[PDB]
Design an enzyme around this catalytic site. Sequence first.
Site, PDB file in Angstrom:
ATOM      1  N   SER A 188      48.130  -1.578  14.750  1.00 18.67           N
ATOM      2  CA  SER A 188      48.625  -2.337  13.181  1.00 18.67           C
ATOM      3  C   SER A 188      49.839  -0.616  13.077  1.00 18.67           C
ATOM      4  CB  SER A 188      47.740  -2.185  11.649  1.00 18.67           C
ATOM      5  OG  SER A 188      46.879  -1.236  12.067  1.00 18.67           O
ATOM      6  N   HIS A 223      50.035  -5.594  12.647  1.00 12.90           N
ATOM      7  CA  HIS A 223      49.590  -5.673  11.585  1.00 12.90           C
ATOM      8  C   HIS A 223      50.093  -5.201  10.946  1.00 12.90           C
ATOM      9  CE1 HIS A 223      45.888  -7.161  13.889  1.00 12.90           C
ATOM     10  NE2 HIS A 223      45.725  -6.229  13.630  1.00 12.90           N
TER      11      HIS A 223
END
Lengths: 178, 178, 178, 178, 178, 196, 196, 196, 196, 196, 6, 6, 6, 6, 6, 6
Positions: free
Chosen positions: J96, J121
């Site tokens: 992420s 993400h």
Amino acid sequence: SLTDSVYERLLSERIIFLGSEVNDEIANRLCAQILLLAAEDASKDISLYINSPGGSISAGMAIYDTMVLAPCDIATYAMGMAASMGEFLLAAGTKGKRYALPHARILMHQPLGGVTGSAADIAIQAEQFAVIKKEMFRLNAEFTGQPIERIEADSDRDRWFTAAEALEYGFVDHIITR
Amino acid sequence: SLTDSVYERLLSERIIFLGSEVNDEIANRLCAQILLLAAEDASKDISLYINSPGGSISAGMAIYDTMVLAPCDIATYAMGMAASMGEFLLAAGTKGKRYALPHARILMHQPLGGVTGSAADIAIQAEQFAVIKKEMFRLNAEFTGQPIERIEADSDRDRWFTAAEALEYGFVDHIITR
Amino acid sequence: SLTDSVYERLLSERIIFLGSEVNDEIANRLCAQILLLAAEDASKDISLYINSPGGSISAGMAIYDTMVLAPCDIATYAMGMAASMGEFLLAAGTKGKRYALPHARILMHQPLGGVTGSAADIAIQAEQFAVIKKEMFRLNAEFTGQPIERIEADSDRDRWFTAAEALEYGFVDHIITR
Amino acid sequence: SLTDSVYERLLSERIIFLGSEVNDEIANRLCAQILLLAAEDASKDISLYINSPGGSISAGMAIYDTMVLAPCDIATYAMGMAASMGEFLLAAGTKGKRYALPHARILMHQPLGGVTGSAADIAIQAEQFAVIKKEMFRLNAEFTGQPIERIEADSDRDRWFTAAEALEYGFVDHIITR
Amino acid sequence: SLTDSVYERLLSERIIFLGSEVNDEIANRLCAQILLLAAEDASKDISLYINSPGGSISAGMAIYDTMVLAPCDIATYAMGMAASMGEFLLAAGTKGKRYALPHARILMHQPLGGVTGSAADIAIQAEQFAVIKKEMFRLNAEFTGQPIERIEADSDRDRWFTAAEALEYGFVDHIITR
Amino acid sequence: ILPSFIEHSSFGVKESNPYNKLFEERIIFLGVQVDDASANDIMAQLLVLESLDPDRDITMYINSPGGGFTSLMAIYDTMQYVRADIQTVCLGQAASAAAVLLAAGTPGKRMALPNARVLIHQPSLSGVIQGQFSDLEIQAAEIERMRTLMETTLARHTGKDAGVIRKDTDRDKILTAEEAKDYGIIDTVLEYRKLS
Amino acid sequence: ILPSFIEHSSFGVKESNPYNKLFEERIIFLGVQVDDASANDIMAQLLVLESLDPDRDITMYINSPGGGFTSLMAIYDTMQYVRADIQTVCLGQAASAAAVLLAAGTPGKRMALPNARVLIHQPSLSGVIQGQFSDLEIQAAEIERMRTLMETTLARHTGKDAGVIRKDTDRDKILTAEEAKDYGIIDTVLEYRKLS
Amino acid sequence: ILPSFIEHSSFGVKESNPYNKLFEERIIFLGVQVDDASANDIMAQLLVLESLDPDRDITMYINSPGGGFTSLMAIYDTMQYVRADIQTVCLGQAASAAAVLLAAGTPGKRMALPNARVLIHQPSLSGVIQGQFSDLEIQAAEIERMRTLMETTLARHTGKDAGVIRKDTDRDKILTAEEAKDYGIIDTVLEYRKLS
Amino acid sequence: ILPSFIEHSSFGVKESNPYNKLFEERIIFLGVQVDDASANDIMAQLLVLESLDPDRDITMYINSPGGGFTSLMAIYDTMQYVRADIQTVCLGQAASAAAVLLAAGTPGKRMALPNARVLIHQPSLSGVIQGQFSDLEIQAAEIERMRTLMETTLARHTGKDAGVIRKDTDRDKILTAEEAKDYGIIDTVLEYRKLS
Amino acid sequence: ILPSFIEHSSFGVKESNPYNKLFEERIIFLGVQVDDASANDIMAQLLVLESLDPDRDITMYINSPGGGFTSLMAIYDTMQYVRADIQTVCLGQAASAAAVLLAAGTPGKRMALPNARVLIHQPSLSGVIQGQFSDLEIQAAEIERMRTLMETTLARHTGKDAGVIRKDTDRDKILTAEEAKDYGIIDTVLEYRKLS
Amino acid sequence: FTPXAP
Amino acid sequence: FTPXAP
Amino acid sequence: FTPXAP
Amino acid sequence: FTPXAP
Amino acid sequence: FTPXAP
Amino acid sequence: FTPXAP
């Protein structure tokens, strides 16, 4: 609750159980059941079934006085364990109606009371205990037909009686066989 | 619940139990039962069975005033312990109808109240307590027929009375034997 | 539940209890009981028994408006404590039917409301409280027959009234004795 | 349960309470009660009593559509608080039958919805909320007879109305006094 | 509770289940059910269904003595597991009426008792256990028709019998097939 | 954060803490650590100070919410065992058992600050209370022994009859710094030695 | 992470922390540690600073959410006992009991920063509240003693009648840095000594 | 806060703690750490002291709430194994298993302070009690073995018949410092060696 | 694991940490420690840096999720009290109360990184919220005082009317690094000084 | 147990740890500590390395389960602020937010090991999420701002349109070490430099 | 605390 | 504790 | 804080 | 961060 | 990891 | 433990 349903149906047959603890909550529950059955019909016997390790000495005395108060014979049965106050209440049933089943085990012993509160309170609880305990022994002597000295010799020790021995000693009048 | 079933059946026999705590929840439950029985039939007596260590002084007074309010005699029984407010309520039953069972133990003493809140609140709770306590002692003097000085001498100490002593003192009119 | 069984039997006698909290849950329970009794038979009185430390000022007002709405007299009784909203509701019963038992204690005081939420919310809760509180005082002045200034002088202090004093002050019309 | 017993007796009088939360569980409970009363007898009115801080905007809409669906007038009463969806449902009752008790407080405001899930989900919940909220405002404009701009000016602020003000504004048709 | 409803309906068909634990709570529940059915009609058989891992040796003996006491035949069925006291109670049913279903598993073994308390108490629990255990073995020898030496050889080991083997051994009189 | 400080001389430079400095001055500081575990530290400190110089007084500062009876008797015996005089100062409070340790210092050397609070309370039920069989006969008997020791021990240091000590102990009597001297626990209440 | 720093001279190189540096400058910093346990550290620090140089003022910085009454009286007596003047500065807040310690500094030397908040609150029920038998007669009496000491102690440092202090104390009165001087707790509110 | 202290000689300057100082004097201090884990420390200390000087007595101070039976037997064997005499002093208390270790010192060298409490209790069920299959046959048998060892071990050090020890052990008998010598655990009760 | 590093010169070899190095460069790093307890560390650091060199600017780096109002006002007053200019840099975020401390630096010296986030939020109800009697009259009044101080304090540093600050504060307004300069909190947004 | 090791030269003997050794080689190791608290350590390390030698590349090793968005943007700005090139290596994973920091290194210098996993993400809702009034209008708006920054930031380092980044980000797309170079995060995947 | 302790 | 320990 | 503390 | 901080 | 990091 | 360990 199947458990409560069965006990209500048995209460109507004038059967009461002391299956645990003999603490203040249990004593209040039995005192209420004994008073209720006596109120409904005092001409009939009440059968008390005991399977209990015992509990507070004062709870056992509340049950005992209620048993005496109720104007009706109370039969008692040792269907398992009858220890400490459980033994007292077994022995306390009407003479000629105290029973034990063959594998019943009876422990004449004393409650140990339990210690709570400040040193000031403990010092009193111990005194009140000593007084109640003395009465427990006096009454066990009357229930079993034994010298008070013998009751004390057996009561301050962890002495278990088999159902057959309990009869010989005087706790139980009959062993029930089939 | 067998426990609640038995108490409802006894409530119909006009029997009320004070088996624990004497706190606000218990006082509300008994005040409701006393008012209910009086409402159903005021021509009949109510029997109050006491087995309680006591509780908040104000809870005991709520029960007491309800007992007085109800236009029917209330018999009281010490079936075990009657301590602090339990003693008060025992002593507070109708004269000639206050009973104790032989192994009952009566403790005339005071509630200790309990301390909560800020210093500002505690300072008041202590004052309200001192006032209620003074009334508790005044009423115990009327209930037992003792000088107020004697009530205080026994009430501020942890002095237990045996059932026989409690009768002699005036808390109890009769000891019930069989 | 013996507790709920007793209250239902009393509800049928048109007796309602306010035995704790006076919070939103309690106010909803009493508003429902008052509406129910009024719906069943508005020609008969409702007796409200109070033994409560008080609670949220808005909960007490919901109960109060329901008491007013119901087209039937509501008698109120101080059977123990009537503090804050408990006092308000006691004082709010129909004139000539506000009662106290002799050991009842009445505290005319204000709810403290309670603080929750963000600074933005607290700033409003405090304002809404100040407005409701002003109405509580206005109504207490009407209920007791006192100058609003006197109500405020006693209401912002922890001033307890004995049942006898509460009658003299105008909260209670009668003290019930037997 | 006295609480549930009282509500069933009131449900038979066609009285429904919204006393808390207005969440999905409450909306399902009221939708079921509204559908039930309408099914039992649609020729009679249903009285909805509101004392609620509000809740999820979608729960309030489920209750609202059920109120509309039921082929019977629904009277609404503000017996305490009617905030957010509580206000919506109050305002949503049949015109001429929307009532408030004198100390009722009405807050026209919006639910804040609440944020849950991943950024992908939050981005949608916010959009669905904006759409439902727009409908809430459109309907409040129809219920109160106000310009939509005024509804928004008051709805996005924590603006409380007293019961008297709420009537003037158009939320309530009558204030109930006695 | 569907579970309790089904058992009450079966209790009326004189069917009792031992589906778990065989501890003091279970023994008190079965002793009460056996006494109840015998009290209602002693001319009819009681069917005891066993599916239990076993439990305290003294609990199993309380159940056993009650089974003997009741003046009515008790049929026993192994519908699953019958281990330790579950086996004892299976074997203890009336001869000619002890049954097992084909996939039933029977474990003749001993309870291990369990150790609690101070060294002084443990030393006694172990002795009481040794005595009760000896009786358990004596009775299993009578129930199965085996030498006591064989009972001990199998009982102190974790030896499982299939339902067919259990019949050959003498625990079960019949295997029930359809 | 208790700060450290530096003290120096021609010998060298020493970094030290408060408390370590107090110990160098022969002061034992008995604080909130009233557990059996801390009683052992007080005994170790008394033994060390006697060893370092047997003829110099040891000063014990007391500011504590009592503690367990058994282990505070362990301190009491060490205090009486040690050759050097032990003087005591009550700062803050000397609750219950700590009031015994306060009284236990050498007569003429028990001191307190003016707002010091001395509380006399009964010994608690603690420590080895693991499950004596007849707890109501045994723990109750052990408690009477502990009450007797506290009453006897205070009587030997306060001059009051043990029966008097019991009447006060049973009621949780609380003494002010001045009342404590009139009661026999404190010989003197310290003046504030301010220069202005 | 409180950083350390290095200070040096021809003698050598010394690594030190803030707080240790403040102590060298005779500043006691009374922060969030308001427990009886920390009261003992403040007393140890006051005694050490007096020992190092009895004629130099001790500065106490106060920034704390009050604390237990009994142990903050222990600090109060040490502050009044010590020969050197103690001056106090309120940073942040001096809540409840800490406001007494703030008032307790030598007159003419009580100071506060402009946004400092001084709160006067009643002493709490804490510390040795283990279970006095008649808690409502005894703890209630002990609380009246504690209220009396706080009211008396502030009156001796603020010039207000103890009855006035009680009326304000009972209502949780909160003073601003300026109100605190008009109330008698602060002698002066510090100017911001910025060079621009 | 156990303070440190500084001791010096012409060699140099040594900072040390109480306990470290006691170890230099050949004193093992057995406190509240009564776990199997601490039994290992006591054994390590006994072995170290024997190694440093096999002919000098080791003094063990006992102030502890008993402990596990198995690991305190480990200490017992080390104490009997070590060549040097071990003398023991009961401070505070020597409960249950610790009373065995107290009795275990070399005869003529078992000592106690006057208010010391010695408690004789049955060995507890602890340590390796993980789930023996027949716990009521096995743990019950192991307990009888442990009771036998405690009774036998005390009999060898007290002179009482093991049967007597059992009767007292079964009733949780508590001995005073003086009763303990008459019972055979203590050879002498220490006088208070005060100089005034 | 914050690594250490070694820096050396002809004088000797010094092992140091990041943060200790930043402090040597007169940088105070205000991170996630936003508790009253850390406010005291920031004040100790500001006082130390002024003491070491009163005429050199102190740089404060701010990267924090706000904190308690009362103790961050304690920092604010110390920042304004100190003679040296304090310059501030917002890294990451300066939420709520920390945005005041960001605005509080000397004008012309408030800085932020390009993706810095500045959040203006109302002061929370925290710290000494122990149970004021009329909490809805007192805590509610204290909150209005705190809101007033935050609004006033930002107005004095941003140039906005306090009424404007309130309207934005009440809505949790979030500013980007650029918006913050147009709002008056930041004087400049730092360029990325990359060599490629 | 991370072992230490000893390195020596004619100067002396130095005991050091892995990580401290990596820092000497100008390697910042970003591991599991992905909290706002650790973001501050990474910034302190970047500032220290630039200070020690502004013209030498800093290598950042990334092996982490993402972290908070706000504080990893604080790292991002420091990385872009620093004069020296920052090169990055993905070991293990860069989930992420850490994938942004991986992409953020100087072009031509983003590297990964062959089994490295890069996950893209959406930014989480965390950090200062204390209770914004209209959380669904405000936190929802703040999230859109955070999504926009992540998408924009990756687009500036990967060459993909921000709209593409969003489509992949919204589906939690996971890239292999090779896919990451084709996606624009990695310039090269490292060969295994084994001598056999 | 001296005098007299120390 | 000496004498006699040590 | 000086002057005057220190 | 310099210039200009430091 | 070098070359090329370091 | 010696002899013989060590």
